[PDB]
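User: I'm designing a mutation panel for trypsin inhibitor II and want to avoid disrupting the core. Could you give me a predicted structure to guide residue selection? Please restate the sequence first so the numbering is unambiguous.

Assistant: Good idea. Sequence first, for numbering, then the predicted C-alpha cells:
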Amino acid sequence: SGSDGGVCPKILKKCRRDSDCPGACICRGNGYCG
C-alpha cells in the first residue's frame, strides 16, 4: 500500500510486479503486496 493510488488491504499475498497484487495495490520489496 502506497499513496495517490497506492491503496491495499492486508498484505500476505506474494507479488511479482506491483500490479501482481489484487486491488489498487502495488508490490513491496519483501516479495508481497503493498
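For picking mutation sites, this is relevant: The chain has one domain: 1-34. The two ends are 4 Å apart (CA to CA).
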